[PDB]
Amino acid sequence: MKLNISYPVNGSQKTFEIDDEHRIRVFFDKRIGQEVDGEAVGDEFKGYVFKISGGNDKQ
């Protein structure tokens, strides 16, 4: 899917196209507002932690 990531300390924001489904399976069964560690979805985001703030499904 796509990841609309925002860093509000700098106010910056960027989308990342993410493939390779076993790294996006860490997002599954997680509610909006729960925090997930970034090293599971990628070693590029290793040491990061994201809070799920929203999103859009297909359609």
Partner 1 sequence: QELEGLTDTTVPKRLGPKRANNIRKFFGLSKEDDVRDFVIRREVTKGEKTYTKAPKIQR
Partner 2 sequence: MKVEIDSFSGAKIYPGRGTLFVRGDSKIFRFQNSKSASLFKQRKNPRRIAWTVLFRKHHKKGITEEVAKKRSRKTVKAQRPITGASLDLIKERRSLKPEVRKANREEKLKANKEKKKAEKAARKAE
**Footprint of partner 2 on this chain (CB under 8 A)?**
9-11
Q: Are strands 49-51 and 12-17 parallel, antiparallel or unpaired?
A: unpaired
| Min separation Cβ 36 and partner 1, Å | 16
Q: How would you class 3 by CB atoms within 10 Å of its CB: exposed for 0-12, middle for 13-18, buried for 19 or more?
A: middle
- Alpha-helical (H) ranges within the chain are 38-41
Q: Which of residues 17-56 bind partner 1 (CB under 8 A)?
A: 44-47
22 is an interface residue for RNA by CB under 7 A: no
Which residues make up the interface to RNA (CB under 7 A)? 2, 4, 6, 8, 11, 13-15, 53-59
